[PDB]
Each structure stands twice: as structure tokens, then as C-alpha cells.
Design a protein around this nucleic acid. Sequence first.
RNA 1: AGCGUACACGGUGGAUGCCCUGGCAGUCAGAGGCGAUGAAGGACGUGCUAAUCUGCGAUAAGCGUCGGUAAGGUGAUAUGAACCGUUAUAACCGGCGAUUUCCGAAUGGGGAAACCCAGUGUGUUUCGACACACUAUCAUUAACUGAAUCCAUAGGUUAAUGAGGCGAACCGGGGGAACUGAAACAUCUAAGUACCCCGAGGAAAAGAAAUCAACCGAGAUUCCCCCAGUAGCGGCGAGCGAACGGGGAGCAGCCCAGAGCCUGAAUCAGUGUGUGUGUUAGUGGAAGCGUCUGGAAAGGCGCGCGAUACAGGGUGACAGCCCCGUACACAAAAAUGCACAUGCUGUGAGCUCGAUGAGUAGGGCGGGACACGUGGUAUCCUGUCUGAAUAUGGGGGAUCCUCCAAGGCUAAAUACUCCUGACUGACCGAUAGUGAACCAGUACCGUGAGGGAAAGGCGAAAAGAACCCCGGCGAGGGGAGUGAAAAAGAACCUGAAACCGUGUACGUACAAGCAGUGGGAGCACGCUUAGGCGUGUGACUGCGGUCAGCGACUUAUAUUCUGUAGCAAGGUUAACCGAAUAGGGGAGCCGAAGGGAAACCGAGUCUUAACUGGGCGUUAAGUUGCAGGGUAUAGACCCGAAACCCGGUGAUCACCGGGAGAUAGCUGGUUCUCCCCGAAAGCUAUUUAGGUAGCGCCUCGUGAAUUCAUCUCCGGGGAGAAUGUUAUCACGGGAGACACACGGCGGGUGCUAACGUCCGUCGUGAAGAGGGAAACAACCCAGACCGCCAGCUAAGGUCCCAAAGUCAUGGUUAAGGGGGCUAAACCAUGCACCGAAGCUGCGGCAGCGACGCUUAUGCGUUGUUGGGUAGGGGAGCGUUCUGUAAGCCUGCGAAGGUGUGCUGUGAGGCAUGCUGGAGGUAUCAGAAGUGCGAAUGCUGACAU
Lengths: 35, 117, 94, 103, 189, 102, 132, 95, 57, 63
Amino acid sequence: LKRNRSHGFRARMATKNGRQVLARRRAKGRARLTV
Amino acid sequence: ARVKRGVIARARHKKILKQAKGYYGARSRVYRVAFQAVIKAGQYAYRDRRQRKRQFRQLWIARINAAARQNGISYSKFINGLKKASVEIDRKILADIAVFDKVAFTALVEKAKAALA
Amino acid sequence: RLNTLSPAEGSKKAGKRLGRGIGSGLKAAITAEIRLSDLAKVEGGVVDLNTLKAANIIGIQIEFAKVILAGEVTTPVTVRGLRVTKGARAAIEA
Amino acid sequence: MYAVFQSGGKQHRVSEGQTVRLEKLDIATGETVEFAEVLMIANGEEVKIGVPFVDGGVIKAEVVAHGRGEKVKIVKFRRRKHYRKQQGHRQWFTDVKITGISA
Amino acid sequence: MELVLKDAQSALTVSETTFGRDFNEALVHQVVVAYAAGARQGTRAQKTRAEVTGSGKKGSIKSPIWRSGGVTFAARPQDHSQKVNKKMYRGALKSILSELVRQDRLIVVEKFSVEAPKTKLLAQKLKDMALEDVLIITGELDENLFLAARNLHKVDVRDATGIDPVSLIAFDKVVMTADAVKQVEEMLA
Amino acid sequence: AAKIRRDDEVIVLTGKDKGKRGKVKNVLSSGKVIVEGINLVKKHQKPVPALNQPGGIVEKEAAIQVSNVAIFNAATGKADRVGFRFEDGKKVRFFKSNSETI
Amino acid sequence: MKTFTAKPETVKRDWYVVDATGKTLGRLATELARRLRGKHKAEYTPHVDTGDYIIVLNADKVAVTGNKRTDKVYYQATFEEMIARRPERVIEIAVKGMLPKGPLGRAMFRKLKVYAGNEHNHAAQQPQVLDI
Amino acid sequence: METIAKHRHARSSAQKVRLVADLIRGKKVSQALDILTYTNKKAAVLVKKVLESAIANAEHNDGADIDDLKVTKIFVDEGPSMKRTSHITVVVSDR
Amino acid sequence: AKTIKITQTRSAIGRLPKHKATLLGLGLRRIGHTVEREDTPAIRGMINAVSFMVKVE
Amino acid sequence: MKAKELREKSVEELNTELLNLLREQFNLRMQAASGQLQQSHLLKQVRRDVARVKTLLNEKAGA
RNA sequence: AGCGUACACGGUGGAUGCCCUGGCAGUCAGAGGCGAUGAAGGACGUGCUAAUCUGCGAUAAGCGUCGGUAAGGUGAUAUGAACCGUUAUAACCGGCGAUUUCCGAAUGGGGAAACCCAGUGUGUUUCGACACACUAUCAUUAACUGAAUCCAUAGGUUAAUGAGGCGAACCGGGGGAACUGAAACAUCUAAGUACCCCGAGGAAAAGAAAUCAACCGAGAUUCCCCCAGUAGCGGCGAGCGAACGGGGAGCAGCCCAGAGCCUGAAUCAGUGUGUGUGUUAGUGGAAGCGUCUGGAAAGGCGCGCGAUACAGGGUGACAGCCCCGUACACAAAAAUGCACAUGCUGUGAGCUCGAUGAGUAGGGCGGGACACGUGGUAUCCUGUCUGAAUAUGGGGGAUCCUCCAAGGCUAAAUACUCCUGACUGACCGAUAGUGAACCAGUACCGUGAGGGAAAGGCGAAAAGAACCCCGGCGAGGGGAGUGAAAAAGAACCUGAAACCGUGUACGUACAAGCAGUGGGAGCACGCUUAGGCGUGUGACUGCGGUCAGCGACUUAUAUUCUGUAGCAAGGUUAACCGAAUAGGGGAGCCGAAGGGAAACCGAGUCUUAACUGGGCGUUAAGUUGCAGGGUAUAGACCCGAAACCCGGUGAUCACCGGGAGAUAGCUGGUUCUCCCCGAAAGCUAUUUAGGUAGCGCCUCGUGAAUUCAUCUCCGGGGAGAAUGUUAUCACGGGAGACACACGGCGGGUGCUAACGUCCGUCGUGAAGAGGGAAACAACCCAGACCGCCAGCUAAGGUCCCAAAGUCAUGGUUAAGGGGGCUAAACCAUGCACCGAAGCUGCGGCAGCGACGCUUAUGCGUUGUUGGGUAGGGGAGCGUUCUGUAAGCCUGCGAAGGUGUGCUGUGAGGCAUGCUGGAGGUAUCAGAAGUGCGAAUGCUGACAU
């Protein structure tokens, strides 16, 4: 549960920098955005 | 205008190797040493094209001297007699007649002795 | 006949490509000058402070000009009322 | 019967019939040249050169064809300076058949 | 000089400096080369070592020596157009016309037209004149002739104002109508 | 529309059967067609006791390009191309060479 | 044509007999080496053993002038004891001294046959007499 | 006549199979079989199987006279890597 | 007048530039070459300058 | 079939849809899994008919 | 027993050749947003399904209506089962709709994304559950409630609207570095660059003078070419950079300021009708046969036909006439953009007077921040008061010149492409092009941001090997059969090298250091009818990590020179228009006149008061394109650091992306042939020791007095003969060297030794091969254009090793590289001989001068020259692509692979055997991703 509590989708989406990271992931087109 | 260098490079390597056959393994198969072996063989051939004249001159002189000694005259005295007898026969022909027919060489040496004095 | 066409000898050079192989080697602003050819025949080129800009011979805003001579004299142009160099009276009148 | 004659600066001892190799000589293929120079004639009692350039001996020979020798690759370059210079050489030659030897 | 009309045996007066000047080989070659180079569409590009996707300096992967790396001197889209002086162009056209006149590759006719836009009529007309690969230059372009000649690959049709140095060379024979001859004479001065 | 339809007498213009007539069985969606006895293949079917195995070598009919078959008309005995023409209400095929409606 | 080359298959060699009594070691050995090498014959060829077999008799009769009887040393004995025990060894070493180094040189040297007594088992070969 | 039989992509080292193949090259099949029978080397089984297959192919595809068959050309070639596999080849012919 | 004969005898590789210039003036551009010369004191001095490598006859 | 039942009222559309679904879907799914029903035509046919009825029954009565 | 060599036959290998459903770079048009009526992107399902792509969403490869089309169809892999339809309800295409699970701004609460858990209202009910809507925040409007505070408000509730998030560039605004370079801090550049945040846009911003200029005058904003890389700024250094004006694309100026006169007047935006023109499906659409090869014809051969269609693609090899197509002519139930006349709602044609923007400028008073600190110091605001008239007045630069602010708006030309359709390419063709032609941002690596690959081809058609046999009911293989081919078998076009094997012929087993080269027997195969001939090996003898691919002086802007072409005292266009490589455009730039400090003069010109000073020019032609040799700036021929900053991810014990192709210094590498000439490591001043500016040597082109060198005489430079291809000097382009070593001679210093020092003579090597002294760059002879199984010689030698005198005429000598020599040693003489790549003899090639045929070559010759490092000059070979080229070769056999022969001084070229099975390309020109043997180079394979 440690991995999800920090790198999980909700935790990443919570902060603006995580939103930017997810946007970059979407732009690149990776199969899995978070895990 | 991209050009692939494969064809010309392979042709050049094949041409270089075609004249390096029989060089004890690597020097006949590895290009990096085959080229050096070919160059060295060429240089040795260039030197030997000249050394051949020296070697054959020495062999002819030895044969002429050996034939003359059978007739009781040394090579230097035989050459002196031929020169003073106005004989233009070359050493190659002298050696050839000496090794083929002895009567001709006996006549040569007798004539050389006659004009020696 | 596009095949036959070819340039003159020495026109195009290959251009050396070094690094390939071993055997391949490697008051002033308003001052101007008038020449005899200038205003030689401009259909009304009478010497004057005007009718010189229109002919488009020297500048646009030029207002002062001389009669300096540089060879090629073939017109008996008469100069009066404008500056004339001391040496200009020999060839202009000839 | 073998005759010794010089044509291109080197003497050749040639027996009757057998063809011999000589330098290039400006003579037509059909023409039959006479070698006015003879240095020896061989018989039961061979006649020696009483005087150089025996005038009494003349060799008759006919040229069959000209040509070039085997290709020779010469590397004038030396000293091992990582340079390649393989020039080619093919010396001109003429094969001549000799018929008739005069003593 | 005088050009035989081939139909009325009437000569056409044309300036010697236009249809009779000496053939300047170098000028014509330069003009045709410039015309060919002007048609180039230099649309190409390669990725330099700073454009190939990647990152890091663990030397660098994007170096030209490395596989899948950038090109050492990657090209960029460039314009190959070459300036040609008006005087040089006119001189080249005059020289080409004079050479065509000398080699009898140029013929003049009264009027060249067909009744209807039918390729069969044009083919028959060219056959009657023993013409297979020709450039017909005219004045006011005729719709019928233009439509008829469009399909025939060997035959081309154009107006006097649309002639080019390459066109007058690549085609075996040129048929300039009298009106076209006058128009070209005026254009070349 | 389609120039070749079911049960149309055709002649194979090219491809090992120049002149052999036939009758079209079906037309494939990829542009090929199957005709009666023009292309015979000797398929070596894998045996299967069930599913009604034909047995041994199956001498069956292969598919050929539609471009290699031309409609055959008994009026002249030679294959000729077929175009489309509008009737009063419908569209019908007709050969060339005097436009004889099919 | 090409200069004649001796064929080892058809080399003609004739036996010879040489007596060493009253002859200098150096000069006799030099003559022997010249005869073994085949240089005397007109058919001499550097790469072919065209010489002839030679038999040396009375090796103990070797004569050398000067004080060489003590100076000479072969391998650390002295010349006197060696001539007393094995006269043939002196001649053998001398002749070896005048021949090329290599398998051909050894082959040529093997032809020489040196003995102290006049009698020899090779008389069945009709060895010719040679003078020096 | 000449009968071929080969095994491709064998799971064995080329040198190991060659060690066994050299023991029968130029030998008669009648003795080759019983020589390979008692050989304890692993490649012996593979070589024996290939030789038996060659003999069977000669039998079915030829008339008779299996006794006189001789091992003429037997060789092992290097094969594709992943432990380099080996291609064994045996040729049996009466003459 | 009387014409003298001069023939180069020895090489000139290991010689001073003055000797080489003298040989060039004498016309001896190759060893063994035989050339004619006139009878003047200049020729005498030229021969005297280099005599260990030339012969006069 | 597609349009003949368009004129049918909403109540009978409801009843026929209920019958078709609750009977055919269950029966086909059960027999389709028990090894029976060698033919799959009915499986698609019933689903398509149910979809067609579903498209009606909303605009006809205003949903 | 192994090893080496050559040939034949095989395996891993996947280079090379041919091909494209993939990319790269651009042109022309559309469009520039999507979403709480639930976006971008995902999870799970859905078919008769074991799996993937695509479609779709519990109505789940689909549903309803209307049109086109229809005899086939139910999407594909990759088939099968089961089914529908065939003349109008099969299927396919398009318009309009219905359905549209869950996560995701997620929005009823919770949470670990696709999960769990509730309330209210309504329908249904098997009265248990089920089915639909709402239940997050802020802001705004109407209403009801509603404390401080009676009313009223803040707040709550109800009804309605907007935002919440995603997205490539462009626009505005606010933040905002560092490395580095300028002779060196500061300063500037770096750079308002990198990077961060907010906003609407289809474009944005700006847009109409209280502007400039000078007494002539331009007149809105934005953009392009000149002016001009000019004036100017700048430790006048790197570097930064104008304006006026001229030529162009667009050219539109308006409204209110508050009243009056006839009214609602034209125009404007919205709201409907009718036509035309498109978009979203579509219909018609010309004209070939025989023959010969050939698996197959579209190829050759003969004769016909269409062409407003010879653009293109497929079809058993290359198709105008086989098919789809193209030109052309037509087509719309429905939705939709544009252009019109039309009923209607709102700003309302035109004239007059006002007004001309007021608590405003100005006056200040004190600050801060604009890099700008009072420094040369300009600028925004107030915490704060005052405050002027309305053209007769005010602002800016006493006269004079221009405008009427403190109110507002304004399309046009202008920047970019996330996306849509067409087209094009001297762009690439699987180690290229994108990282990705294939199930790629996948496998895989890291907890994380992030990093990130390898991998194409059977065949025309699977006709994908029935059947038999070995084997374990395997893997694999041998037959049979299909196929033109199985030398196409699913590891499937072509199939090279390294590497590993079998057979044949030859040679060879103690440590040499080379396994090469000249001679050369022997052995096996073919000649030849013998001549010692070719191939394979090489006893003996003189001399003496690998393979294939990729990878490096390119491009842009200025300046100088050379060759070449047009015009010529003229040359020449840029932007732009354009019938678009034509023509127009002379705005603009260079030159024709220089001298002179400026001034001034002028084919003449100055200094001093003028020169007994020397002028500087004309008489030499400049300009515009093309190609090339240099220089400078950009990354600058290619590869190779530590460090600093910014934005993020982890503190489970710093890392990822970007500035950045950073910046230094110093190594390493730089790929085809031939010919001619051919260096240097030395000197002067500076010396911020970085070097610099010159001198000096080399080469090429031009000019020059016949210049210079050697020898003689005369005088302490002058004259005279011949020889030297001007070897002499000047000009211009381009170089290299700029740390030289050794040694004889004359030295200073000194062991009166020097390889410590720098000089003039120099010779050797660098950059010169060969002979001799055993070898040995420094000792002597001697400068290799090529071939010859020719001769004569120099230094040195003549007993053997080892070619040549045990030579002769007289003496001395007992000392003893190898044996040894009593002369086979030393001192002299003579005749000889050996002795090099020196010289000569024959043949052959190339450069440079003169004389006579030809005036480009080709000849009688004449002669001469031809070692070469760095460097300069000249002439050529090779590969991709473009025009020539719809021409030519080519299925009777292309490209490629592999042998042979011929040919060229060589780079290379031609023919042909086998394999290969469809492309290649002559001649002449044009453009290069153009030539590999190393860069601890990279990729794959093979070794160890």
C-alpha cells in the first residue's frame, strides 16, 4: 500500500505537478499512466 | 543522394584478397594483414627482379670457372684470353655451352690461351 | 539536343574534396560632378540650375554641379552661368 | 647446329627450327628478316670467331607475331609510409622462327 | 532574313540579330541549366544530433558515429533558384532560334488550326506534314487545337508568350505560326 | 455495378486457359472469381474422419482474377466487353459490337 | 630459354681417393670442401648436391707447420691427444668448417669418408684415384 | 545410388557429435550399428538414430541389399545458437 | 682551335655547391659523360677547380 | 417485421418485449451453454429483435 | 595423430541487389477548439470464440427513418459452423436520430482509477427488491425566509446562467536564471534567453497625432525590399543597432459628447420564405485481334481502332483499346456554408447650433521601483491641497511651423499548424527514414520522474507436401505429389565475409621468426603427340581479436581573388504585380576623377608665403550571374571534461528533463588513382610568453632588363669565352616550417674534451633506395622512370663458407665473423678478374625547351629530365539521383553473388560459365548523406 499511497493515481492527481506529470504521460502515450 | 558503400568496398576487398592466396592463414584471410602481406610481397618482388641478374651472373661465372679449371686455366685468364682474342660471347652462352657440350668449351679455352700471350 | 550542350572550357571546376585517399593530393552634401557623357543629349539639356534632376543624371537633391571633364567629349555643349573649371575651356570649345 | 647471335643487347643461343624470343623489332609480321650477325656455328668441328661479328654467318628467321608479356605489378614505393602504388608493366616481345643456318 | 512559309512561298522579314546570330554554346548551356535548376523543389531534411529523440550524456548516443544517431551535416530545405539576366535569357532564346533556323528544325505556316476539338483531325494534319514530335507555337491560343494536342504525348502546343529555352530544344521540330513569329520577334526586340 | 455475375458464360482471356469457356459459380469479394473447370488444383487435404472428409487428393476449382475472364456471347462466338445502359426504369448490361442487350 | 638446373634425381657422381700424407691440413681440407660442394664440376648448382664422394686415407699423417700443434684446440683437450686417439675427427671438423650451414650442407658433408688405414670397405665401388 | 538422412537443430554440441561420428566414418553399417550400440557417449544415441533412419530410407526407396551399405559421408555442422545446436548428416550408399 | 675532351670521373653527391655549379658550367650532368670544350684560360681554371672528379684527354 | 409492428400500442409493445426477452434470452443462453442449440442464428436474431423493440417503446410513448 | 595451402560440396551468418500499405520535407484550400446535455485519455464487457486489431456499449462488429447502390452478404487475422438475400426491408455507403456500463474536472460520502457505501423524489411490484432524476464549490439574477439591527441586510432555500478540466503553435501580461566571451575586475553580451503562471482569440496587439521635420514639407495601424549592417552606441573592443526618406500588398475612418427640423428615411445584426452555387452517398464514361518465345504476355513480329480520356493503379513479365479508373456529361429525401428580393424586432438618411472630453493638466511637497544609486539621469503612482479658457485659448518644437488630449470603436494586408482533403519531391529505402513500415512508446530497466530497443519479403494463385517409411502416437528427415522453380517448405526472394565442417592433391612433427620473395626439383590433374607448357603444393637454396554496415571540410551571411558568359560608360534589379522560370517594377547598389589634413581645385590636382619637391590620375572597363581557391561570423571537418542554473521525482539508502551540438585546454581520427615541382625546424622588433607583425624557404600565373651561377684578367666593383630548359628580380593566389638529430672544418665557453651554447662551410637523415666495413641513421662509394636469365665500372675484394689470382716481380714477419693459413699476414710494383638500382646495350612510358610537317592531337627529331616527407599545380576513375529517356538492353534472362579471359601506368572497364529471376541504362550536362585500415568509434555476427 506504500507504493499506491505516494505514486497512486489519486495522490498524483492531487497536486499540480502530478497533473503535469500525467499530462506528459498522456502526451507520450504510455500504456500505463501511473502503475 | 544517399549512396551505399557496400558494393564498391566488397569489390575492392575481393580484388585485394584475390592476389593474396596462399599466405598461411590470417595473412590470406584477414584483410588488415593481407594488405600488408601483399605490399611486402610486391616490394620483395621489386628487389628480386634486380637480385635475379646478380644471382644468375654469379652462377654463370661459377660454371664458367669450373669448366675452365678442367682445361687448366683460371677464370680471369680465360676472360683475358677471350677479350684479347676479340670474342664477344656472353657469360650466359659460355655457361650454356660449358654445361651442354665440352668440345665447344675446349675450343674456346684453346683459342683464349693462344691469344693470351 | 540536350546531350550536345556543354559549357565552355574552364567554366565549371570539380572542386577539391580533401580527406579522400592519399594519391588525390590532400557643402559636401550638395557637391557633385558632371561628365561629358552625362547630359550629352537629353532633349533640352541646356546648362542651368534646373532641368538636371529630371534627366536623372546625378543624385536627386543635388543643387550645385560643375563641368568637370573625364574624356569622351563628343558634344559641343555650351556652358554659361555655371561654374567652369579653368581646364574646361579647352575641350568643351574644341 | 646451334648459332649464337645478339639482337636486343642480349645474346641468344638458338638451335635450328626452335622458335626464340626477342625484343620488339619494327618489322612486319609477313617479312622475313636476316640476322647478319652470328657469333658461333656448331658442327662436328665448330667454327670459332676468327674476327668479331663473323661476316660469313647469316641467320634467316621469320617473325610470326608481336605481343605483350605477362602482366607485371611493380611497386616503386618503399620505406613503408602507408602508401600504395602498384603500377603495371608489359614488355613488348616478338617470337621468331629461324630456318636455315650458314656456316 | 527570309523564311519560307511552305504554303504560299512568301518570305517573312525577320531581323538578322534575332534569327541569325551566331550560336553561343556557353550562354545557351548556362540558361538551360538555370532553367532546370529553377524547377527543383529542395524539400528534404535530416535530423542532426540535437534533434534525434533521446537524452542523457552517459559520450552521447546521438553522436553521428553511434548507430541511430544524427547526421553529421544534416541538410535543410533550400532554394536552388539561380538568377539569370534578362539580356542573357533573350540572347539564349535568340541563339536557339537562329540554330533551329540553321538546322531546318523550324518551319513556318500561314495558320495552324483544326475544325473541331478532335485529336484525330490533328493527328491526320500532322501526318500530312510528316510531323510526329513537334512544338506548335501560335498567337491567340485556339481551344480546338489546345484540346486536340493535349492527348498526343509527342506533340505540344503553346502560345508565343510561353516559350522556354528547354522547350525549343527538347522537341525535334518547332512550328511557329506567322503571328507567333511576329510576337516572338517583338518580345525578343 | 459488377460486369461479371452469377451463371454467366465467360472465356478466360489469359492464364493457361486461353479460349476455354466456362460458367461462373461465385465471385469473391477480393476481385477474384471461380469458374467451372478452368483452374483445377490438386489440393492435398488433411484427413479428418469427421466433417465428411472428401478423401485423398481433392481436384477442385481455384479462383482467378476477374480481369482475366470476358463475357461470352453466342451471337458472334467471341468474348467482348460489356457496358451498362439505362432502360426505362432499370439498368441493364449490354455487349459492345452492335450493342446487343443481355 | 632458361639456364640449366641440375636435377638431383639424375646427378652423376664418381668416387675419388685422396691421401693426406705430407699435406697441409688447411689446404687439403679446402680442396676437399671444394670437391664435395661440386664446384669443380661444370654442373654446379647451389641448391643441389652435385658433388662427388671422396675417401681420405691416412688421416694421422696430417702435417701442420708452426706452433699450431699446441695453439689448435677443438671442443678442452689439445690437438696432440686428439690426433693420437681419433685422427679422422680433425679432418671431419676441418671440412665441416668449409661448408654451408643447413640440411644441404650436412648432406654434402656426409659424402666424405675419412679413415686412418688405407684399406676401406668401399673398394667395391671402384673409387678412382685423385692427386693433390 | 546414394541415400541421405540428416537431423537438424539437434540439442548437442557439434564437437561432441563429431567425436562419435569419427568412430564410424568409412565403416560398414553392419558394424557401425553394433559399434554405436555399446558406446556410452550421449551423441551415440543421436548418431545411431540418424544412421537407422538412413538405412530405412535406403530400404524403402531402393530395392534390396542393405548388407553392403557403407557409411561414406558423415558430418556434423554448427547450428543456430540459443549452446550451439548441431546438424547431423549421414550418407549411406552401396558403392 | 684545338678542342679538348673532358669526362666526369667521380660522382658529385658529397660535394660542395660550388663544385656542383662548376660541373654544371662544364656541362658534365652525368658521370662518365664525355664533352668537348675550347682552349681558354677559363676552361683551365674550371678544370683546376675540380680535377679529382674529372679527366682530360 | 421492422415496420409492421410500428402501429402497435405501447402496452402491447411492453408485453411482447417482456415476453421475448424473459423467454428467448434465457432459453437460448441456457441451451447455448448446455451443448444444445447447434445453430447460432437464433442467438443473434433474438438479440437484434430485442434491440429493435427497445428502440421503439420510448419515442412511441415519449419515454 | 594433427597443422598449412588450392579446389569442390555444406551449416550459423544476414551484407549486397529489387520492392513498399512507413516516414521526412512543402504547396494549395478548410478549420483552429472539445466538455456538467459529462471533455482529452483509460478500465470492463460485446461475435457461434481459444487470442489480437477495429467497431459498439446491458438496444453492446449493432437499433429506427430517409436516399444511392445492390447479387451478394454476416469487418480482418485464418479459416470453419450456422444463417440472410437475389429486382427491391440481404449487405455496403451517406443525412437525420435513439441507446451510450465504470474511472477520469468527477460533482451524494469514502477511497488504493476504473471499487465500496448512502439520503430524497417518482414509477413499478413477486409489497422483498428493482427502474429514472437530484444530492461538491464559487460567482451572478428573480423570489421566499432571514441575526448583529424595528424595517432592512449578512446567511440559508427555491427557479435560471457562467467557470472549474483537456489541447501543438501563434498573441498579450506577470515572473524569470546560469555556463560562456570581450587584452583583465566592474560593465556589456549571454538574455528578457532557458524555464514557470493567467487570459480571449481565429488570428492577436496596435490603429487616426496635443507625431516629425524645418520655413519646402510626409500625413491611421501592421507587414515586405532599400535607406543600412549606414549614422550612432560600445574598456570605439567583442558585439548592439537607427531614423528621415524612396518603392510595394491593404487603404476605412467613424460614433457619442445634447438639443432643434421632415421622421422611424439608407445601412447594420437577428428573425422566415424562393432560386442558384458547393460539402456530406453517387450514375454514365471510348476503342484488339493473329502469331513467336515463354509457367504465364501486358514483351518481339503484322495489321486495326479511341483519344476533351496516353494522370494513375491492379491483373501469371513492361497494357491507351482486360478491370478499376481519367477527360467530359449528370446526380440529393435529408443536414449544412455562401449570394440575392422578401414580412418582422432593434441602432435609424440628411441640415443647423452646441461640444471639442474639468475637480482634468499645471504647481508642487516625500518616497519607493523601473539596470539606471543625483551619477551625464530620464521615468509610473500617490499619503496630500489648489486648480485655469473654451479656436478669441491650450500643447510641442520672441518669430514661425503642426494638433485639439484628459470619451469609445475600427475588417484589410500580418504569425503558427493539434486536425481535415488533394498534390508534389535530382528526400530515405529496414544499421536509412520517426524511437516505432511488424501487436512501439510495446518488451524491458528503475519504487520515481524517466529511460527505451531488436524485429519487413514463400508463391501469380496455399495449390502450405494426400499417401508410404525411419523415429518415441515426438523433434527431424527420405520418398510421392503440387508448383516454372522445394538451388521457393512456412527459420520460406537474392544469400557475400569472418567462423565451423567432409572429400581430393601437395608439404610438414627439438627452441629460431618468418613462413614472403628469385631460382626451383619432386609429386597429381590437363596440354603438347616430346621442346622442361598451365593449374595445385613447395624438399633445397640467396635475400628478408576477425568480418559486414555506418562515420567525418557540409550549409547560410559578408569580404578578397581566379576561370568563364551577357552587356559595356554603362551594368543591374529587390519587395511586389504577373497571362507566374516570360513581361512589368530603375526604389535601390557599383563605376565612370582624382588630387588635396579639411577647405579648395580639377585632367589636372598639394604642402611652404610659391617651390630648384615629388605629385595622383586618363591613356588599364565597370557591372551582373555561374563554378571554384581563401578569410570572418554561426555548431563550423568529426569524436572526446569537471563544474553552474532552471523545472521536476525520490529522502524505502541523491536521481530525470532542459540551458547544451555549453565552455576551456590537449590528445585521437579524416576514406579513390596518376603526373610535375618540392620545403623547413632559420633571422628582425614586440614579447599581456598567448604569441604577434615581418624577414626567410616552397609552389602556381603574369611582367622584366638576355637576369643569375661557374672559370680567367683588371681594380679593392669592371671586362672576357662557352655551359646551365631563367637556375636572377618584381607583382598576385596558395602553402608548409617556425622545439630538428648526428658528424668533418674555423670557434667562444671549456678537462684549450663534448652529441651544454649559437654562429659561417657544410655532408647524412628527417624527405634517398643500393654496394662495402659481419649487422648497425652518424665511415667510404653512390641519388632507384619501367622491363631484360646483357656488358663495362666506383668503394671494397679474388683459399672455402661466398663471385672473382692458392697470379708474378722483391723484402719483412713465428701475433695467431669461423676452418685455417708461416703466408690464406705486413711493406711496394704490374697484369688481370669479381664487385651497385653507377655507366653503357635493346625495348617501353611521361614532363619540359628549339628547329621543320600538322598549328588540338599525331611526327623527323633535337636534347634534357623523371628518389621524395610537409606543401603547391595539373589530369583522371568510381557510386546515388535529375534532363537527354514513352529512346536503348532486358524472361532467348536485369540488378546482385561467385570464377575465368581480355584490357588500362591505376583508380577502373568489357565479355563470358554457374547462381540469381526483373530490372538496368549509353553519350553529354547538372546536385552530392560520394570512395575507410585503426578515432580505448557505434550496431550485428563470429571467435576466445
